[PDB]
Amino acid sequence: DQVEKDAEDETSSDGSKSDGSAATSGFEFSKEDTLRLCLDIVPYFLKHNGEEDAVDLLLEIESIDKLPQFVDENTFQRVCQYMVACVPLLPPPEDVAFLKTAYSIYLSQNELTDAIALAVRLGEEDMIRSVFDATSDPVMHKQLAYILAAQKTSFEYEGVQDIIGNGKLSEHFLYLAKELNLTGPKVPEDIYKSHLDNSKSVFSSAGLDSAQQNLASSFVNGFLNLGYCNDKLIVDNDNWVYKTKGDGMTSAVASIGSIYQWNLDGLQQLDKYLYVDEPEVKAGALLGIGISASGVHDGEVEPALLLLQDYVTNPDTKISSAAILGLGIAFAGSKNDEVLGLLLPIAASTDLPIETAAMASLALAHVFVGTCNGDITTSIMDNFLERTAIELKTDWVRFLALALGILYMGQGEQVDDVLETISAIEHPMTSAIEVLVGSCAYTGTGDVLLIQDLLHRLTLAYAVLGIALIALGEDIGKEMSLRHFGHLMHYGNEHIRRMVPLAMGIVSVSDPQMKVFDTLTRFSHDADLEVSMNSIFAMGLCGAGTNNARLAQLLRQLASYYSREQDALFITRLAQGLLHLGKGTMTMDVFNDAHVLNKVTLASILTTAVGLVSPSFMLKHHQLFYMLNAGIRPKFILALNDEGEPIKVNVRVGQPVLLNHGERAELETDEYISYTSHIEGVVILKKNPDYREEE
Amino acid sequence: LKQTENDLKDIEARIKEKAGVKESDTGLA
Amino acid sequence: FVSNSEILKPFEKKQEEEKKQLEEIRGNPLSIGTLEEIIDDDHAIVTSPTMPDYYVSILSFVDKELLEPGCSVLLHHKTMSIVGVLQDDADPMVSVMKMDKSPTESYSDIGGLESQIQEIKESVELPLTHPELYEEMGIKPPKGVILYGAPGTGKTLLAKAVANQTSATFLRIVGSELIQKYLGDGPRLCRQIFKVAGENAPSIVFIDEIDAIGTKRYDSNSGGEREIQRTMLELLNQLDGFDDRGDVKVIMATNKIETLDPALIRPGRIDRKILFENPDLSTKKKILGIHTSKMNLSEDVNLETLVTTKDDLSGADIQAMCTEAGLLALRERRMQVTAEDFKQAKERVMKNKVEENLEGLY
């Protein structure tokens, strides 16, 4: 009771890697005389080899000093490997500070096995270099970098990344410039782009005649060409774009940016439309570059985002509309104060028709997520409390409220400045935030009061999204969540109606449901025509990257809508584009194979929920249709040999008869034992001495 | 908007069912 | 809690007036009725347990979609009109429904029953994986499977083994529960089996142990019941009328098919009759692993030694073999069963079935 109550309420973290840590350092969690009582259990299970039942009593007492004293002699491999899947969570609560104090004893020895899983999860600087010390094979150092680079989370933005990615010659560092491209989505994403040329499906691309019909003509080309490069249709005819004017010209050029996605340099081909005559033509160029460079902060071999950042300055409107929205996508993973310093005075007056600052709240959320900055924390906090300029309407108030409900993830003591803005103005989405602060601060979740308390407020749109994230890691509230999702689907306001399909579309890939598609039938005509115009596009968001199969019931609903008017001809094209989006095969991944969570994919869901509402109530901008591409993760399963470089090798079959390096597949395991941390996705395999083969 | 009209069928009509239906069901039907 | 304090609390205060008009129609002396037929004219048929069958008018309380023929509702003593519907969460509507998604049993874990796998795989997995092969021949793949033998070996293992490779949800329905306690629910439970599994249909329906309802005798009276014919006649129309690509599957189990209704068989819809095969060394070790897990055994006790010399016993005698071995330790007052008790109990059960087969034949 002394160590539990002292380690319960605190503003700091828990655990230390120092060898002289008795857990008496700093704040005193327990008396000095009572410390020897916890060590009395160590000599008991030491000779008896009771480590199986010794961990059971170690997690209940919550003592960080007991673990490093228990492990002394004999084998550090089999004994420590059992603690990998046992120690961190047996009980519903999560204590991550136990494995941190045991690093000092292993520092002189460690092992090839237990030092692997220590580099992921918390990911301390001493844990990553620990496995590199006992590994004398440069091949095994490569495999350890694939699971770490895909984790992102803590270390993302500039000042950490690309500084380590340079590299030198040493045994304790060994980060190659090629490993950053192989581990991270750099080289492998380009092979999938070229491999789609042979596997491409039929194309609906047509240019028609009239400019009113050229808007839907070029717009569908952006969805069809995702992951595909077609230079024949764009270069041969330049009239299918320029004929569009107003807000349609910006969305037409953005479709070309999807062609150049995952390319070395996409700015050269888009330079022709960068400056011609009219600002409306110049506006679409900025939105197209952000789509082509989305997913990579530094590019591949060159930082192509250096020139894009300098184009944000402009007194005009249509260009500034696509400058804030277009650039707020490709900058994920790269933090710079030059774009923040220029955007701060523009977002002060927040005038929609002139400066078009309404998208500044969504741009700052997708870029700076998972970063540490004192400039954006202080400036937005003062502007929110002062309520300066003309700000009155709740629309812009909810933008700054939901923008600050993101950046504080992965912070700790920096969250206290954000909490002042949350408790200032009450919001329906900010009531559930107070109980979710302990998720990131206490390093994990699953307590009774951290889940069930969210279900009482539901029986607005932010609380239902958090249920899907907690149910993936809990076997209790997961079964009862299926019933609560059906009652929240029918409600007066449209905010909760539009949130459910976005959350169910990810769950429904492996679990189709008839009740979800049947609601979308009556979801079209309800009250206002704005819901009907948004209903056609909402039914395509769930079927993105999938055709026929389970969607055959949903496909019949979109076939009855062709053209009911001049505008309906364009609206129905948005449904056909998402159906064939990515040549018919795509996916949505909110997590990775490292058993962690990415704050970028989570921030893209909250950003998409705020935007995209142009056809629905609260008209903002028609350029928000491309927001979905910011959160779409690639789908591939790689394979490697002992050389570490990409090479053709055969693995287990997928969903198409063989899977090579750079070919599409998802959720496929392997029976071959790898070197270090055999998992899904990219892995370096090996062959047993029994049979000798090159495949 | 449509939430009131859904329950309106079971509310406004219930008032008429008190006098109208009970009189038609008189005689232990 | 905090969010709903400013929402639900002022909501119930404004909705209190509508609740006062409800209770006036509700009334204190309520009763439980029984539905028969529902018509769009707001009229129904209700019965209280003393059987005064009535006919009354349906008032306005809840949507008609919540009302289903054959259910229980609420009544009042004045006009006997329906004042509300009874909650069905406590009383199960079907007989026995257990939904098992992606079970543990597979084709490789059932032992030497592979001879039975080749027959069930062609009638289940083959039309599901490659439905286009039957379109060229213009034939309907049989959705039914007739199982023989005793439970615990052939019927229990193979039932859940087919759902693993086909990625199907296992539904176990007791066959002796097809006549359930009430008159008029025969055609209702038959539709609920195909209705729940008809929307999605990654599922296979399983039925076992029918000794009764398959026999209509010479009439529905003089010892017979009408509930027997309600389920049998409706099951024939639902199985023959419903055709699909091989998603929905219904598999029954019976020891003797001579007593079943030949009209219910409907030849050509179910072409699959699977016999019972004897377990090999692999299957017998699976039954022993369940009982010997909690049973105490020394390091000299091996599952391969017991199955080496055996009379090839069924699942009932194998379970009784380990049962008799435990009585030898109770008479000697010991908690540890040695290897001699398993060998001694194996010979006793083996000699209780077949020994000399009445030696003869010259």
JSON list of C-alpha atoms in Angstrom, two decimals, chain C residues 140-296:
[
{"chain": "C", "resi": 140, "resn": "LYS", "atom": "CA", "xyz": [-26.88, -28.07, -57.40]},
{"chain": "C", "resi": 141, "resn": "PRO", "atom": "CA", "xyz": [-24.23, -29.07, -54.83]},
{"chain": "C", "resi": 142, "resn": "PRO", "atom": "CA", "xyz": [-25.79, -30.83, -51.82]},
{"chain": "C", "resi": 143, "resn": "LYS", "atom": "CA", "xyz": [-25.84, -28.65, -48.71]},
{"chain": "C", "resi": 144, "resn": "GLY", "atom": "CA", "xyz": [-26.79, -31.48, -46.34]},
{"chain": "C", "resi": 145, "resn": "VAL", "atom": "CA", "xyz": [-24.59, -34.08, -44.64]},
{"chain": "C", "resi": 146, "resn": "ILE", "atom": "CA", "xyz": [-25.86, -37.24, -42.94]},
{"chain": "C", "resi": 147, "resn": "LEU", "atom": "CA", "xyz": [-23.61, -38.44, -40.11]},
{"chain": "C", "resi": 148, "resn": "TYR", "atom": "CA", "xyz": [-23.44, -41.90, -38.54]},
{"chain": "C", "resi": 149, "resn": "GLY", "atom": "CA", "xyz": [-21.83, -43.41, -35.47]},
{"chain": "C", "resi": 150, "resn": "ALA", "atom": "CA", "xyz": [-21.64, -42.19, -31.90]},
{"chain": "C", "resi": 151, "resn": "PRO", "atom": "CA", "xyz": [-20.87, -38.69, -30.58]},
{"chain": "C", "resi": 152, "resn": "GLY", "atom": "CA", "xyz": [-17.50, -37.71, -29.18]},
{"chain": "C", "resi": 153, "resn": "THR", "atom": "CA", "xyz": [-15.48, -39.14, -32.09]},
{"chain": "C", "resi": 154, "resn": "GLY", "atom": "CA", "xyz": [-17.10, -38.97, -35.55]},
{"chain": "C", "resi": 155, "resn": "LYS", "atom": "CA", "xyz": [-19.97, -36.54, -34.99]},
{"chain": "C", "resi": 156, "resn": "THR", "atom": "CA", "xyz": [-18.32, -34.18, -32.49]},
{"chain": "C", "resi": 157, "resn": "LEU", "atom": "CA", "xyz": [-14.93, -33.73, -34.17]},
{"chain": "C", "resi": 158, "resn": "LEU", "atom": "CA", "xyz": [-16.05, -33.54, -37.81]},
{"chain": "C", "resi": 159, "resn": "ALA", "atom": "CA", "xyz": [-18.82, -31.03, -37.02]},
{"chain": "C", "resi": 160, "resn": "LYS", "atom": "CA", "xyz": [-16.39, -28.29, -35.95]},
{"chain": "C", "resi": 161, "resn": "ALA", "atom": "CA", "xyz": [-13.56, -29.46, -38.24]},
{"chain": "C", "resi": 162, "resn": "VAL", "atom": "CA", "xyz": [-15.33, -28.42, -41.45]},
{"chain": "C", "resi": 163, "resn": "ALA", "atom": "CA", "xyz": [-15.85, -24.83, -40.25]},
{"chain": "C", "resi": 164, "resn": "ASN", "atom": "CA", "xyz": [-12.15, -24.09, -39.69]},
{"chain": "C", "resi": 165, "resn": "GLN", "atom": "CA", "xyz": [-10.90, -24.49, -43.27]},
{"chain": "C", "resi": 166, "resn": "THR", "atom": "CA", "xyz": [-14.10, -23.04, -44.77]},
{"chain": "C", "resi": 167, "resn": "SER", "atom": "CA", "xyz": [-14.00, -20.08, -42.32]},
{"chain": "C", "resi": 168, "resn": "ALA", "atom": "CA", "xyz": [-17.55, -20.85, -41.20]},
{"chain": "C", "resi": 169, "resn": "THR", "atom": "CA", "xyz": [-19.42, -20.16, -37.97]},
{"chain": "C", "resi": 170, "resn": "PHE", "atom": "CA", "xyz": [-20.47, -23.33, -36.14]},
{"chain": "C", "resi": 171, "resn": "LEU", "atom": "CA", "xyz": [-24.07, -23.45, -34.88]},
{"chain": "C", "resi": 172, "resn": "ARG", "atom": "CA", "xyz": [-25.07, -26.44, -32.75]},
{"chain": "C", "resi": 173, "resn": "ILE", "atom": "CA", "xyz": [-28.81, -27.17, -32.51]},
{"chain": "C", "resi": 174, "resn": "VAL", "atom": "CA", "xyz": [-30.12, -30.01, -30.36]},
{"chain": "C", "resi": 175, "resn": "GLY", "atom": "CA", "xyz": [-32.39, -32.33, -32.34]},
{"chain": "C", "resi": 176, "resn": "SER", "atom": "CA", "xyz": [-34.50, -33.43, -29.37]},
{"chain": "C", "resi": 177, "resn": "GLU", "atom": "CA", "xyz": [-35.40, -29.76, -28.82]},
{"chain": "C", "resi": 178, "resn": "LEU", "atom": "CA", "xyz": [-37.20, -29.42, -32.17]},
{"chain": "C", "resi": 179, "resn": "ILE", "atom": "CA", "xyz": [-40.52, -29.91, -30.34]},
{"chain": "C", "resi": 180, "resn": "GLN", "atom": "CA", "xyz": [-40.41, -27.05, -27.83]},
{"chain": "C", "resi": 181, "resn": "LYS", "atom": "CA", "xyz": [-43.00, -26.81, -25.10]},
{"chain": "C", "resi": 182, "resn": "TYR", "atom": "CA", "xyz": [-45.44, -24.66, -27.11]},
{"chain": "C", "resi": 183, "resn": "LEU", "atom": "CA", "xyz": [-47.96, -25.03, -29.93]},
{"chain": "C", "resi": 184, "resn": "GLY", "atom": "CA", "xyz": [-47.65, -22.82, -33.01]},
{"chain": "C", "resi": 185, "resn": "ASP", "atom": "CA", "xyz": [-43.90, -22.14, -32.86]},
{"chain": "C", "resi": 186, "resn": "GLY", "atom": "CA", "xyz": [-43.01, -24.93, -35.30]},
{"chain": "C", "resi": 187, "resn": "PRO", "atom": "CA", "xyz": [-42.81, -22.83, -38.48]},
{"chain": "C", "resi": 188, "resn": "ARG", "atom": "CA", "xyz": [-41.33, -19.89, -36.54]},
{"chain": "C", "resi": 189, "resn": "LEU", "atom": "CA", "xyz": [-38.16, -21.61, -35.31]},
{"chain": "C", "resi": 190, "resn": "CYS", "atom": "CA", "xyz": [-37.52, -23.07, -38.78]},
{"chain": "C", "resi": 191, "resn": "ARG", "atom": "CA", "xyz": [-37.34, -19.60, -40.33]},
{"chain": "C", "resi": 192, "resn": "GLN", "atom": "CA", "xyz": [-35.21, -18.14, -37.52]},
{"chain": "C", "resi": 193, "resn": "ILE", "atom": "CA", "xyz": [-32.46, -20.66, -38.31]},
{"chain": "C", "resi": 194, "resn": "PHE", "atom": "CA", "xyz": [-32.16, -19.45, -41.90]},
{"chain": "C", "resi": 195, "resn": "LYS", "atom": "CA", "xyz": [-32.95, -15.81, -41.05]},
{"chain": "C", "resi": 196, "resn": "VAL", "atom": "CA", "xyz": [-30.14, -15.23, -38.55]},
{"chain": "C", "resi": 197, "resn": "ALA", "atom": "CA", "xyz": [-27.65, -17.12, -40.74]},
{"chain": "C", "resi": 198, "resn": "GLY", "atom": "CA", "xyz": [-29.06, -15.68, -43.98]},
{"chain": "C", "resi": 199, "resn": "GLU", "atom": "CA", "xyz": [-27.87, -12.08, -43.75]},
{"chain": "C", "resi": 200, "resn": "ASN", "atom": "CA", "xyz": [-24.12, -12.76, -43.58]},
{"chain": "C", "resi": 201, "resn": "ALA", "atom": "CA", "xyz": [-23.87, -16.58, -43.88]},
{"chain": "C", "resi": 202, "resn": "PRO", "atom": "CA", "xyz": [-20.31, -17.56, -43.04]},
{"chain": "C", "resi": 203, "resn": "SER", "atom": "CA", "xyz": [-21.94, -20.40, -41.12]},
{"chain": "C", "resi": 204, "resn": "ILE", "atom": "CA", "xyz": [-22.89, -24.08, -41.12]},
{"chain": "C", "resi": 205, "resn": "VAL", "atom": "CA", "xyz": [-25.94, -25.29, -39.18]},
{"chain": "C", "resi": 206, "resn": "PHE", "atom": "CA", "xyz": [-25.47, -28.51, -37.18]},
{"chain": "C", "resi": 207, "resn": "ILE", "atom": "CA", "xyz": [-28.22, -30.75, -35.79]},
{"chain": "C", "resi": 208, "resn": "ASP", "atom": "CA", "xyz": [-27.75, -33.95, -33.80]},
{"chain": "C", "resi": 209, "resn": "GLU", "atom": "CA", "xyz": [-29.72, -36.69, -32.02]},
{"chain": "C", "resi": 210, "resn": "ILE", "atom": "CA", "xyz": [-33.16, -36.84, -33.61]},
{"chain": "C", "resi": 211, "resn": "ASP", "atom": "CA", "xyz": [-34.95, -39.97, -32.38]},
{"chain": "C", "resi": 212, "resn": "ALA", "atom": "CA", "xyz": [-38.48, -38.59, -32.55]},
{"chain": "C", "resi": 213, "resn": "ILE", "atom": "CA", "xyz": [-39.64, -35.71, -34.76]},
{"chain": "C", "resi": 214, "resn": "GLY", "atom": "CA", "xyz": [-38.53, -37.58, -37.88]},
{"chain": "C", "resi": 215, "resn": "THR", "atom": "CA", "xyz": [-41.36, -40.04, -37.13]},
{"chain": "C", "resi": 216, "resn": "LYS", "atom": "CA", "xyz": [-44.91, -38.86, -37.83]},
{"chain": "C", "resi": 217, "resn": "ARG", "atom": "CA", "xyz": [-46.32, -42.40, -37.40]},
{"chain": "C", "resi": 218, "resn": "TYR", "atom": "CA", "xyz": [-49.71, -42.98, -39.05]},
{"chain": "C", "resi": 219, "resn": "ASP", "atom": "CA", "xyz": [-51.38, -39.72, -37.92]},
{"chain": "C", "resi": 220, "resn": "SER", "atom": "CA", "xyz": [-51.01, -36.60, -35.78]},
{"chain": "C", "resi": 221, "resn": "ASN", "atom": "CA", "xyz": [-53.31, -37.95, -33.04]},
{"chain": "C", "resi": 222, "resn": "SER", "atom": "CA", "xyz": [-53.69, -41.01, -30.77]},
{"chain": "C", "resi": 223, "resn": "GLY", "atom": "CA", "xyz": [-50.34, -40.37, -29.10]},
{"chain": "C", "resi": 224, "resn": "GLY", "atom": "CA", "xyz": [-48.98, -37.95, -31.69]},
{"chain": "C", "resi": 225, "resn": "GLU", "atom": "CA", "xyz": [-48.49, -34.21, -31.37]},
{"chain": "C", "resi": 226, "resn": "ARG", "atom": "CA", "xyz": [-49.12, -31.41, -33.86]},
{"chain": "C", "resi": 227, "resn": "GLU", "atom": "CA", "xyz": [-45.84, -29.65, -33.02]},
{"chain": "C", "resi": 228, "resn": "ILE", "atom": "CA", "xyz": [-43.96, -32.56, -34.64]},
{"chain": "C", "resi": 229, "resn": "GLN", "atom": "CA", "xyz": [-45.53, -31.93, -38.05]},
{"chain": "C", "resi": 230, "resn": "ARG", "atom": "CA", "xyz": [-45.18, -28.13, -37.86]},
{"chain": "C", "resi": 231, "resn": "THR", "atom": "CA", "xyz": [-41.37, -28.27, -37.81]},
{"chain": "C", "resi": 232, "resn": "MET", "atom": "CA", "xyz": [-40.99, -31.21, -40.21]},
{"chain": "C", "resi": 233, "resn": "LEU", "atom": "CA", "xyz": [-43.18, -29.77, -42.98]},
{"chain": "C", "resi": 234, "resn": "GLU", "atom": "CA", "xyz": [-41.68, -26.28, -42.71]},
{"chain": "C", "resi": 235, "resn": "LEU", "atom": "CA", "xyz": [-38.10, -27.59, -42.69]},
{"chain": "C", "resi": 236, "resn": "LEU", "atom": "CA", "xyz": [-38.70, -29.30, -46.05]},
{"chain": "C", "resi": 237, "resn": "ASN", "atom": "CA", "xyz": [-39.90, -26.09, -47.71]},
{"chain": "C", "resi": 238, "resn": "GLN", "atom": "CA", "xyz": [-37.12, -23.94, -46.24]},
{"chain": "C", "resi": 239, "resn": "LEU", "atom": "CA", "xyz": [-34.38, -26.39, -47.27]},
{"chain": "C", "resi": 240, "resn": "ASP", "atom": "CA", "xyz": [-35.71, -27.12, -50.77]},
{"chain": "C", "resi": 241, "resn": "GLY", "atom": "CA", "xyz": [-36.87, -23.57, -51.51]},
{"chain": "C", "resi": 242, "resn": "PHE", "atom": "CA", "xyz": [-33.74, -21.73, -50.40]},
{"chain": "C", "resi": 243, "resn": "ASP", "atom": "CA", "xyz": [-30.80, -22.05, -52.81]},
{"chain": "C", "resi": 244, "resn": "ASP", "atom": "CA", "xyz": [-27.49, -20.22, -52.63]},
{"chain": "C", "resi": 245, "resn": "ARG", "atom": "CA", "xyz": [-23.83, -20.40, -53.68]},
{"chain": "C", "resi": 246, "resn": "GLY", "atom": "CA", "xyz": [-22.91, -22.67, -50.76]},
{"chain": "C", "resi": 247, "resn": "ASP", "atom": "CA", "xyz": [-22.84, -20.13, -47.91]},
{"chain": "C", "resi": 248, "resn": "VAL", "atom": "CA", "xyz": [-25.69, -21.43, -45.75]},
{"chain": "C", "resi": 249, "resn": "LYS", "atom": "CA", "xyz": [-25.25, -25.09, -44.81]},
{"chain": "C", "resi": 250, "resn": "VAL", "atom": "CA", "xyz": [-27.43, -27.41, -42.72]},
{"chain": "C", "resi": 251, "resn": "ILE", "atom": "CA", "xyz": [-26.00, -30.70, -41.44]},
{"chain": "C", "resi": 252, "resn": "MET", "atom": "CA", "xyz": [-28.03, -33.19, -39.40]},
{"chain": "C", "resi": 253, "resn": "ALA", "atom": "CA", "xyz": [-27.06, -36.31, -37.46]},
{"chain": "C", "resi": 254, "resn": "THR", "atom": "CA", "xyz": [-29.00, -39.52, -36.89]},
{"chain": "C", "resi": 255, "resn": "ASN", "atom": "CA", "xyz": [-28.12, -43.11, -36.05]},
{"chain": "C", "resi": 256, "resn": "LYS", "atom": "CA", "xyz": [-30.95, -44.70, -38.07]},
{"chain": "C", "resi": 257, "resn": "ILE", "atom": "CA", "xyz": [-32.39, -43.18, -41.26]},
{"chain": "C", "resi": 258, "resn": "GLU", "atom": "CA", "xyz": [-35.11, -45.81, -41.76]},
{"chain": "C", "resi": 259, "resn": "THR", "atom": "CA", "xyz": [-37.47, -44.10, -39.29]},
{"chain": "C", "resi": 260, "resn": "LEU", "atom": "CA", "xyz": [-37.08, -40.64, -40.85]},
{"chain": "C", "resi": 261, "resn": "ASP", "atom": "CA", "xyz": [-39.67, -39.20, -43.21]},
{"chain": "C", "resi": 262, "resn": "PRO", "atom": "CA", "xyz": [-38.73, -40.12, -46.81]},
{"chain": "C", "resi": 263, "resn": "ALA", "atom": "CA", "xyz": [-40.55, -37.00, -48.01]},
{"chain": "C", "resi": 264, "resn": "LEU", "atom": "CA", "xyz": [-38.38, -34.89, -45.69]},
{"chain": "C", "resi": 265, "resn": "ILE", "atom": "CA", "xyz": [-35.28, -36.47, -47.25]},
{"chain": "C", "resi": 266, "resn": "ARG", "atom": "CA", "xyz": [-36.10, -34.86, -50.63]},
{"chain": "C", "resi": 267, "resn": "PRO", "atom": "CA", "xyz": [-33.68, -36.90, -52.76]},
{"chain": "C", "resi": 268, "resn": "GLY", "atom": "CA", "xyz": [-31.34, -34.88, -54.96]},
{"chain": "C", "resi": 269, "resn": "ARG", "atom": "CA", "xyz": [-31.03, -31.94, -52.58]},
{"chain": "C", "resi": 270, "resn": "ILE", "atom": "CA", "xyz": [-28.91, -33.89, -50.07]},
{"chain": "C", "resi": 271, "resn": "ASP", "atom": "CA", "xyz": [-26.70, -36.43, -51.86]},
{"chain": "C", "resi": 272, "resn": "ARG", "atom": "CA", "xyz": [-24.15, -36.85, -49.04]},
{"chain": "C", "resi": 273, "resn": "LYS", "atom": "CA", "xyz": [-24.40, -39.86, -46.72]},
{"chain": "C", "resi": 274, "resn": "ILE", "atom": "CA", "xyz": [-21.22, -40.35, -44.67]},
{"chain": "C", "resi": 275, "resn": "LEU", "atom": "CA", "xyz": [-20.71, -43.60, -42.75]},
{"chain": "C", "resi": 276, "resn": "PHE", "atom": "CA", "xyz": [-18.73, -44.01, -39.51]},
{"chain": "C", "resi": 277, "resn": "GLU", "atom": "CA", "xyz": [-15.04, -44.93, -39.58]},
{"chain": "C", "resi": 278, "resn": "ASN", "atom": "CA", "xyz": [-12.98, -46.46, -36.79]},
{"chain": "C", "resi": 279, "resn": "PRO", "atom": "CA", "xyz": [-10.42, -44.19, -35.10]},
{"chain": "C", "resi": 280, "resn": "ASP", "atom": "CA", "xyz": [-6.72, -44.73, -35.74]},
{"chain": "C", "resi": 281, "resn": "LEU", "atom": "CA", "xyz": [-3.80, -44.36, -33.33]},
{"chain": "C", "resi": 282, "resn": "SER", "atom": "CA", "xyz": [-3.92, -40.57, -33.77]},
{"chain": "C", "resi": 283, "resn": "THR", "atom": "CA", "xyz": [-7.59, -40.10, -32.84]},
{"chain": "C", "resi": 284, "resn": "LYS", "atom": "CA", "xyz": [-7.39, -42.37, -29.78]},
{"chain": "C", "resi": 285, "resn": "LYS", "atom": "CA", "xyz": [-4.53, -40.30, -28.35]},
{"chain": "C", "resi": 286, "resn": "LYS", "atom": "CA", "xyz": [-6.70, -37.19, -28.68]},
{"chain": "C", "resi": 287, "resn": "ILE", "atom": "CA", "xyz": [-9.43, -38.63, -26.46]},
{"chain": "C", "resi": 288, "resn": "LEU", "atom": "CA", "xyz": [-6.85, -39.76, -23.89]},
{"chain": "C", "resi": 289, "resn": "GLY", "atom": "CA", "xyz": [-5.22, -36.32, -23.78]},
{"chain": "C", "resi": 290, "resn": "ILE", "atom": "CA", "xyz": [-8.42, -34.76, -22.44]},
{"chain": "C", "resi": 291, "resn": "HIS", "atom": "CA", "xyz": [-9.00, -37.20, -19.58]},
{"chain": "C", "resi": 292, "resn": "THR", "atom": "CA", "xyz": [-5.35, -37.90, -18.67]},
{"chain": "C", "resi": 293, "resn": "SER", "atom": "CA", "xyz": [-4.63, -34.15, -18.48]},
{"chain": "C", "resi": 294, "resn": "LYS", "atom": "CA", "xyz": [-6.19, -33.78, -15.02]},
{"chain": "C", "resi": 295, "resn": "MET", "atom": "CA", "xyz": [-5.56, -37.45, -14.21]},
{"chain": "C", "resi": 296, "resn": "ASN", "atom": "CA", "xyz": [-2.32, -38.06, -12.31]}
]
